[PDB]
Design a protein around this ligand. Structure first.
Ligand SMILES: COC(=O)Nc1cccc(NC(=O)OC)c1
Ligand SMILES: [Cl-]
Ligand SMILES: [Cl-]
Ligand SMILES: [Cl-]
Ligand SMILES: [Cl-]
Ligand SMILES: [Cl-]
Ligand SMILES: [Mg+2]
Length: 346
């Protein structure tokens, strides 16, 4: 049952992998990644060797979290898990984890900056993001880090969501950085407990950029970005102010001069009127009032692509481990069980 493994040192790293994976070639370095040819399936694949997966309780729980999430995702518009392996023959010598996925080429950046997009292209790309999100949200999963570099696109305009937020540092979110330009205001400034509606804000930011070729809210810091957002969508009323839990944050908002919501047809000049209408329903300051992924799929902007018999939901996903307190070796044993129970797709 156990395959034969072979060892090799590539760029100061030891890689021990099953014989099926050939012609390993480093491509990036969290973990290190190699491209390879999988002789069992015929696919070009990415093989990621996790870096120090069990060095702390926090790191061991993050390793388990990532493996549980990747094993669950089975949808055309979401990255899935092709294989997971360890060279260890027992729990006692278990130390290294390797994850195998389809090798992705271009991301949405490699097209948004370098192609001329028709409205039909925007329809199809945003449709696929929303189709994947309906699936993800049905399992009570929040992606949290949707942005163009986390969307893989091929030559036929087919799209997959990847790089789920596994819980970014303070430094990474500081200044003039794309890591923050797509984040909902309530999570950027920790206004309140957030939920899956944060992902819909991100989709609105992405759709605007596909239509205009420009970043929607390219703030130089958190406060500059908030000012760009409030100039477009308006300052909050008392109803949303009630829902912001920090007194200082409420005090800060009330120090700003009030502004009305702008006319989106005069911002997205020349855009399909149905695209303008959908943007107005995603880019709503109060997260309770944003359109959901399931509701957006039925919007008339997608009439050409919507098929309610081919927009599936996910199997239920048990996240009870997140509130559980365990020792490093217990998280490590749970991870080992998940490695050895993996069953590959058809
Ligand atoms: C700051 O200028 C704007 O207000 N709007 C803008 C800028 C650049 C491109 C587009 N394009 C667009 O809307 O295509 C549908 C719109
Ligand atoms: Cl996949
Ligand atoms: Cl090992
Ligand atoms: Cl990006
Ligand atoms: Cl005022
Ligand atoms: Cl589950
Ligand atoms: Mg990424």
């Amino acid at each position: 049952e156990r395959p034969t493994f072979y060892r090799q040192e590539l760029n100061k790293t030891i890689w021990e992998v099953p014989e099926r994976y050939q012609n390993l070639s480093p491509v990036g370095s969290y973990g290190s990644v190699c491209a390879a040819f999988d002789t069992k399936t015929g696919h070009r694949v990415a093989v990621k060797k996790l870096s120090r997966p069990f060095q702390s309780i926090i790191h061991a729980k993050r390793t388990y979290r990532e493996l549980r999430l990747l094993k669950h995702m089975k949808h055309e518009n979401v990255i899935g898990l092709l294989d997971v392996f360890t060279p260890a023959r027992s729990l006692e010598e278990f130390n290294d984890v390797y994850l195998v996925t389809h090798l992705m080429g271009a991301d949405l950046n490699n097209i948004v900056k370098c192609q001329k997009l028709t409205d039909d292209h925007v329809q199809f790309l945003i449709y696929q993001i929303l189709r994947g999100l309906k699936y993800i949200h049905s399992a009570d999963i929040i992606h949290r880090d949707l942005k163009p570099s986390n969307l893989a696109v091929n030559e036929d305009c087919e799209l997959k969501i990847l790089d789920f937020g596994l819980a970014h540092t303070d430094d990474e979110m500081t200044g003039y950085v794309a890591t923050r330009w797509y984040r909902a205001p309530e999570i950027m400034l920790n206004w309140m407990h957030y939920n899956q509606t944060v992902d819909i804000w991100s989709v609105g930011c992405i759709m605007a950029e596909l239509l205009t070729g420009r970043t929607l809210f390219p703030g130089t810091d958190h406060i500059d970005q908030l000012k760009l957002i409030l100039r477009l969508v308006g300052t909050p009323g008392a109803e949303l102010l009630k829902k912001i839990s920090s007194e200082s944050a409420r005090n800060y908002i009330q120090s700003l001069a009030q502004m009305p919501k702008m006319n989106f047809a005069n911002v997205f000049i020349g855009a399909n009127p149905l695209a303008v209408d959908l943007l107005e329903k995603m880019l709503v300051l109060d997260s309770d009032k944003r359109i959901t992924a399931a509701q957006a799929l039925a919007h008339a902007y997608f009439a050409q692509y919507h098929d309610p018999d081919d927009e599936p939901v996910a199997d239920p996903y048990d996240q009870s481990f997140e509130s559980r307190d365990l020792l490093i070796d217990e998280w490590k044993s749970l991870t080992y069980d998940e490695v050895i129970s993996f069953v590959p797709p058809p």
